[PDB]
C-alpha cells in the first residue's frame, strides 16, 4: 500500500506543520521550515502541498522578504516534483478577523479581507493552483443581536461576486471552493453544511465558478453522513476539491488522520469517490497529535495516504464481488436507478396497477435484504470473505 | 397575552391527535375526532388546522366513507371559521413506505408514492390550502450499499418534477414546501437540513414552485442554529411555511410545545419572523407529552400561542429601545448593511486604505461591543429593564 | 467465524421478535413465537435467551395462561439446550408507567412496580437467571418542576433496597445490574450513564448485590467511549453483564447490529473484554431494523456474532504481534502500569529529581509515539499487516 | 439586580485574564496584572477570586519572584477585602503535560506533578482557601491502545490517595473537589461526567476529603441535564464547589457568561442551589468572548451576576407562588417524597392493593398535569404572570 504521485495525496503546509498549540496548551513541536515539509512529503509519496498565505510569507513581510520565501519555496517544488494544487487565504488568525473577514461588522475590515485575499489569488495563479478554497471560519456570531445573517450574506455574496470579477477580468484559469463547518472557532458558522454553500453558490452572479470543499470532520460535527453530503455534491457538479481527515462525533475538530474516527464512514467515502471518478486532489487537512514528536508526525502523514490506499482496494473488492453483485439485485438498486415514471405524467395517472389495483400488502412484505448486504460491506471491509 | 385567529396561528391534526404512543409504550389516550380538535382549537383562538391524508380519512377507506368523512370535516371548518392553509402526505407510516415513498428502491412503490399525493392535492385544494408540505421521513437508509444517493436524488427531483407538472396542468395555485430532518426514523434522512433542501430546490424544473418548511427540533437535531437558517431561507425568498415547537438539544426527536427547550433561540426566532415581515402561518408541529392527559393536551396547545405572543412583545421592546439601538450602533450593525465596495473593483484595487495604508492595529483594537448587547437581549428576554 | 454455545452469545426475545413498529411507522413483520425464536437461535450458534416478563406472558395473563406459556417456555429449552442467564421486567410499555415504575409520582403506581418486579424475580430464579436486570427507561423527566431529582434518587434507592432485601431473605443466588440511558423516551433518563449507576450502587444497604448492565449505543447517545466506561465497570469490579449493539453517534437509539456504528470502538470492546476476561454473557440488545423480513431477522441477528469472533480474532493478533509489544514499551505502556510512588510520600516529597532537579524540557520532548501504534492497530483491524 | 460580598460570587484569575487565544487565532486583549483583576472585580460587586498556580506566578520563577508576586496579591486583598476560597493547579498548559499529569504514561512525569500540586497546596492554605479543584484535562487519550484504562485509574487513585495523606499529615483544612469533562482538550478525559467522579471517589482511601466541582457546560459537552447531575452530587453529600457558564449544546467548550448558552437549565439550576441551600462560592469559570475589549470584560464578568440574581428572584417567586404550590400537588410531587414502602416489605407483599387488586387503567388514566406547572415556571421566568 505504497502511494505514488499519481494518487494524487496532497497535504496543507499547516498540517504536518502543527505546531500543536490548542486552547489549552503551549507548542510541542518546533515550527518547521516549508522547504523541509515539501522534502519529507515527497519522500513519502505525495503529490503536492497547499498553503495559506501566511503559512509561507509570514504576515507583515516586506516585499522583498516575500520574493525570496517565495524563491525559496519554488525552488523545492522544482527539486522534488511536488505541486501546488490549491491555495488559500488566512482570514482567520490575526486579531482584525476576530469578527470575520468578508462578514467583518467593520467596514475598513471587509475591504482588507478582499484585499489579502486578491493577492494570494495572484499567487497561486503563479505557482500552478487550479483551486481556490475559502473557509470563513470567522463569519459567525456567540450571540443572537451580534449578527444580522441577511446583512452578513448579502456581504459574503458581495465578495464573492467581486472575486469572481477579479478571476475572470484577469482571465485566471481558477475556480473557488467554499468550505463549510457548523461551528467553532464561532459559537455559529455561517454556511454551516454542504447543503448551505450549495444553496448559496446558486445566488452568485457566476455560480459556475464555484463548488464546495467539504472536509469529514467538519460535517461530523453536525452528525451529518459524510459520504451523502458527498454525494449531493457530486449530483450538483459541484465537488472542486475535498478535505479528507477523522473525527469521533460530535465534538471539537480532532483533525485526526484519514482513516481514524468513523472508519465505515471512510469506507463508503473511498468507495463513493472511486466509482464516481472524483479526480481532484485528495487533500489532508489534518493535525499529528500534540503528544507526537517529528518521527510521529511523519508517521501520522504516512497513514493517511496508507489507509486510503487500503480502503479504496476493499471497496473495489466489495463492488466487483459477484455475490455483492447479486444481493445489490436482491435489494433493488437496479430499480433504484431507473426513471420511476418515463412514461410521463398522464400515463402515470391513467395506471391502475400504479393505485386503484396496487397491492400495497404484497409489496410491503417484500424484505429489502439489507443486512444481508450490509454483512457482505462488512466482511470485505475487514477482509473475511 | 390572547390569540386570535389574526395572528394565524395553526395546528396538525396528528398533534393535539397524538395517542402518545412511542418507541417504547402505548397509547396513553384515546384518538380525538377531528371534528372536535377542529372545535376545541377554535376556542382556543386559533386560525386554522392541517391534515395529512391519513389523518382526516382513514388509510383504505371507500370513496363512500372519504366523502363523509370530508363532509362533517367541512361542516365543523363552517361552524368555527377556522382555516386549511396547509396540507401533506402520510408517506411514512404504513410498511410498504419502510423503504421510503419518491425514492424507494422498488419502482411500484414510487409510482403509488405519486398517485397517494395527487390524489391529496386534489383535496388540499378543494379545501383552500395555499402550501403543500412534503416532509420525506423515510427517504434515507441504516447501511451506506442499501442507497446510492446520486440515484435518489435524481428520483427525488423526478416526483417534485412530476408534482410541479401535476399543478401547473392543473392551473391550481398551490406552491411546494419540503421539510428537512437529519435522521429519525431513517438511520440518515436525504435533505438533512434546510441548507440540503435550498440546494436540492435549484435544481427542479420549476423552482419558483418550490420553497421551504423548516422545523426548530428538526434543525436542532443536528446542532445547529435554527435563526440562521431561517435567516437563510428568508435571504432565498424560500420561507413559505414553519413548524414551531421545542428540542432540548441533540437527542430524538422531542417536539416539545413552542418555547420550551431553547428559550433564546426562540427569542430570536421570533425577533427575525416578526423583523422580516414573514406572514404565513405559525404553525405547531409539536406532541403533548404522553404523561398528560386530555386537560394536559389543550393547556400545552395554548403554552404555544402564549409563548409566541410573549416573545413576539418582548423582541418588540428590544428593537424599539434607543438603548438598544445605540449598542447596535455602537456595534457596527449598522455598517455591515452597508456594501463592502460599491465603489467597485477597480476602485477597491486603487484604494491604499483598503490595504497598503490600512492600520490592522488599530482595526484589530476596536472592541465589537456583543456582550453588552447580549446583556440588553437577555433582560429584554426575562422583564429586567 | 462460526459461534457456539461456549462463546456464551444471548439475545433477548424482543430483539429478533421486534414488530418494527416505530414513533412514525406500523409493525412491518408478524409477532414470532418465543418458542421459534428458542428453536432459530439455537441453530445460529447462541448459547441462551433473555426476557422481559411481558415478553414470555402476555401482560394480564391468568395464573393459568402463565404457566401455560411458561411451560412451553421450559420445553423449547430442553429440546435445544438454550440457557436464561438473565431477565428483567418491563416497567415501560403499559400507559400506567408513563411517569416511571420506581420512581413514579404516584405513590400506588411505585408499589405496584416493585410487586411486578418480584414476581418475575421468582420466575428468572425458577429458569436459573443469575443476574437480574433494571433499565428505569420511564424513570425521568421533560420539564425541570415534573420531578425533584432528590426525592427520586430516594424512591429508586427505597425500590433497590427492598428488592436486596426480598433476595436475601429467600435465599436467592441472583445479583442485580442496573442500565444505564441518558434519554429517549423520557426528556433525561435518572442515572443516565455508567458512573452516574455506579456512584449510585454505593449509596444501596447492600452494594455487593448489584453492578451494572451497559449498552454500547447507550453511552453513545452521550457522545462517550464505551470502551473507557467498561474500563471503570471494570475497575470497580461492577461488570455484571453487557449489552452489545451499534450506533452512529448522538441520536434517537438505533439498535443496529454489534459491529455496525462505531467500528473502531467495537475492536477496542472486544480488546478489552477479553484481555479482562470477562465472563458473562455476551448479550445482543438489537432490532433487525424494519426494512428486514425474516431472513433479514436471522441474518442480522447472525452478523452480531460474526462480527464479535472477527474482532475478537483481529484483537487477539494484535497483542500477540512482538511489533506492537514493542510498540506498547516505546509509548510507554508498561510505565504506566507501575506505581508513581510505591517509596511513599516522604520519600517523594525528598526526591530532588521528581522536581528541583527534574528536567522538564527534556521530559516534554520525548514523543508518545501514539501514531504508530494507533496505525499498528488500524493495519491489524483491517487485516492489512 | 446587584450583588454584595455575600452573594458569594467568585472569578477565577483566567477568566476575565483570557487574552482571547484559540485554537484558530491569536491574543485580542493584552495581559491583565492579577492585581488590576482584584481590584476590577471588586467594585463590581464580587467576594473573591480562584487562581492556578501558574496564573499567579509564572512557571519557573524563582523562590525570590514567587515571594513578590504572592506579597502584591496578598496586598490586594488587603486592600479589597476580596477572599480566596479555592485554588488549582495548572497540569496541562506545559508541553511536559501533553500526555497528562497523575496518569502520564511516563512515570518522571506523574511525579512532578504531583510534587507541583503539593507545592501549590501549601500556598492555598496560606491564602485561606477551604477547596483544592483537580480538573485533569490532560488525563486521557485520542486512541485506543495509548492508555490502559484500569491501569490508569490505579494511577489516579494512587495520586489521590497521596494527596489525602499529604493533607491530613500536615493537618490542613482543605478539601478537594475533581472537576469532570468528557473531552477537550483530550479525544476523551478520563472521568468524563460526574456521576464517574462521584464513583471514582467512592474507590479512595478516605472519601470524605472529596467530592466534585461541576461545571455547566461541561456536563452540557455530554448533552445532559446539569441540574440533574448537580442534584445526584447534592444527594450524595459531594457538592462542594461548582463553575458557573453557558453553553450551547454539545461542541467544543464555549465558556460563555452564565445565563446565556441553555437559559431554562439556569432557571432550574439556580431553582435547584437556593432551595438546596448550597452555601459553597458561585463560581464563574467563563471567557469574554475574544470579540471584546476590556469595557467588553467587565460587562461580561457583570452579567454573570446580574443573571444569577435575576434568575434567583424568579425562582423565589415560582415556589412561593400558591398557584405553584397546588400545581406541584396537582402533579404529586408531594406524593414523591413519600416512602413507597415504610411498612415493610412483608406488608408490601400481602398488600392486595398493590397488585392482584391495583386498578391499574384508572392509575393509567390519571394526568400528570406537567404541563400546565412547566407553562407557570416558563411565565415566572419571563416575569409574565
Ligand atoms: O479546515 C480548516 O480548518 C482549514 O485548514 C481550512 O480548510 C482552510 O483554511
Ligand atoms: O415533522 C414531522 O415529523 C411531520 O409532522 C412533518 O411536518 C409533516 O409530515
Ligand atoms: O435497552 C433497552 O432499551 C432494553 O432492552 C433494556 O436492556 C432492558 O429493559
Ligand atoms: O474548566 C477548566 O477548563 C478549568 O478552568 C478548570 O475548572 C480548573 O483547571
Ligand atoms: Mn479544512
Ligand atoms: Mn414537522
Ligand atoms: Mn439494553
Ligand atoms: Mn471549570
Not at 123 to 131: D, I, Y
Not at 233 to 246: M, V
Amino acid at each position: 500500500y505504497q502511494p505514488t504521485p499519481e494518487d494524487r495525496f496532497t497535504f496543507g503546509l499547516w498540517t504536518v506543520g502543527w505546531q500543536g498549540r490548542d486552547p489549552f496548551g503551549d507548542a510541542t513541536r518546533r515550527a518547521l521550515d516549508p522547504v523541509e515539509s515539501v522534502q519529507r512529503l515527497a519522500e513519502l509519496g505525495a503529490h503536492g502541498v497547499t498553503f495559506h498565505d501566511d503559512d509561507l510569507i509570514p504576515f507583515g513581510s516586506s516585499d522583498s522578504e516575500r520574493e525570496e520565501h517565495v524563491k525559496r519555496f519554488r525552488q523545492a517544488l522544482d527539486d522534488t516534483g511536488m505541486k501546488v494544487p490549491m491555495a488559500t487565504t488566512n482570514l482567520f488568525t490575526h486579531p482584525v478577523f476576530k469578527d470575520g473577514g468578508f462578514t467583518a461588522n467593520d467596514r475598513d475590515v471587509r475591504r482588507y479581507a478582499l484585499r489579502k485575499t486578491i493577492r494570494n489569488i495572484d499567487l497561486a495563479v503563479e505557482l500552478g493552483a487550479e483551486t481556490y478554497v475559502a473557509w470563513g471560519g470567522r463569519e459567525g456570531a456567540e450571540s443572537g443581536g451580534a449578527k444580522d445573517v441577511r446583512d452578513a450574506l448579502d456581504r459574503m455574496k458581495e465578495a464573492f461576486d467581486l472575486l469572481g470579477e477579479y478571476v475572470t477580468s484577469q482571465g485566471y484559469d481558477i475556480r473557488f471552493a467554499i468550505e463549510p463547518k457548523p461551528n467553532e472557532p464561532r459559537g455559529d458558522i455561517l454556511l454551516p453544511t454542504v447543503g448551505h454553500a450549495l444553496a448559496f453558490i446558486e445566488r452568485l452572479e457566476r455560480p459556475e465558478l464555484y463548488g464546495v470543499n467539504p472536509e469529514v470532520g467538519h460535517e461530523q460535527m453536525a452528525g451529518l453522513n459524510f459520504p451523502h453530503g458527498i454525494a449531493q455534491a457530486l449530483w450538483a457538479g459541484k465537488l472542486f476539491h475535498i478535505d479528507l481527515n477523522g473525527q469521533n462525533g460530535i465534538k471539537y475538530d480532532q483533525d485526526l488522520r484519514f482513516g481514524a474516527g468513523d472508519l465505515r464512514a471512510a469506507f463508503w467515502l473511498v468507495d463513493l469517490l472511486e466509482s464516481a471518478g472524483y479526480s481532484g486532489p485528495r487533500h489532508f487537512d489534518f493535525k499529528p497529535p500534540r503528544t507526537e514528536d517529528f518521527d510521529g508526525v511523519w508517521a501520522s502523514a504516512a497513514g493517511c495516504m496508507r489507509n486510503y490506499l487500503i480502503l479504496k482496494e476493499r471497496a473495489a473488492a466489495f463492488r466487483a464481488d459477484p455475490e455483492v453483485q447479486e444481493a445489490l439485485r436482491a435489494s433493488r438498486l437496479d430499480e433504484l436507478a431507473r426513471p420511476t415514471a418515463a412514461d410521463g405524467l398522464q400515463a402515470l395517472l391513467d395506471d391502475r396497477s400504479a393505485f386503484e389495483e396496487f397491492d400495497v400488502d404484497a409489496a410491503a412484505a417484500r424484505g429489502m435484504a439489507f443486512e444481508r448486504l450490509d454483512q457482505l460491506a462488512m466482511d470485505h471491509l475487514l477482509g473475511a470473505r
